[PDB]
Amino acid sequence: PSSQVFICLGLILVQIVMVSVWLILEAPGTRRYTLAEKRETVILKCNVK
Amino acid sequence: YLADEFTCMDCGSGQWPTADLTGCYDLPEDYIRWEDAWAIGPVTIACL
Ligand SMILES: CC(C)CCC[C@@H](C)[C@H]1CC[C@H]2[C@@H]3CC=C4C[C@@H](O)CC[C@]4(C)[C@H]3CC[C@]12C
Ligand SMILES: CC(C)CCC[C@@H](C)[C@H]1CC[C@H]2[C@@H]3CC=C4C[C@@H](O)CC[C@]4(C)[C@H]3CC[C@]12C
């Protein structure tokens, strides 16, 4: 009843902190990605590469 | 894009010269869309 939930929640919280610090460091946004090999096209991309 | 008659310039990666070569306009943006594309299969898969 307790130890499994505690361990799983601990791992989930560790991952949540490790990703929240990354989102804090790198502000989210949208980028107009373009390719010189193709051009004439603009891709609205999530700021994560 | 010909900024002047004698000298030709560029609008940058984001912008493109117009058909009349008189100004720089933002290029259309592309993304995954539900309107008759490869997303119908993934949508049905997610629903199932
Ligand atoms: C959705 C997430 C983020 C939070 C909720 C999940 C946790 C807190 C929930 C989900 C399932 C729940 C358990 C379901 C069944 C039992 C067995 C019972 O004899 C005592 C309570 C206990 C042990 C519950 C405790 C709380 C519990 C562990
Ligand atoms: C008490 C709990 C259950 C509240 C909900 C927790 C989650 C959903 C919340 C708590 C704090 C939140 C973060 C707070 C601030 C930022 C910076 C922003 O630039 C991107 C989103 C981001 C990274 C949020 C993501 C969602 C977040 C992690």
Instruction: Kindly state if the Cβ of A24 falls inside 6 Å of ligand 2.
Output: yes
Residues of B in contact with A31 (CB under 8 A): none
Nearest protein CA to atom 6 of ligand 2, as residue: A16
The conformation of residue B28, written as its DSSP 8-state character, comes to: P
Q: Cβ distance A35 to A41 under 8 Å?
A: yes
A29-49 in b/e form (b: 16+ CB < 10 A) is: eeeeebeeeeeeebeeeeeee
Q: Cβ distance A33 to A42 under 8 Å?
A: yes
- What are the strands, taking DSSP E only, across chain B? 15-17, 24-26, 29-30
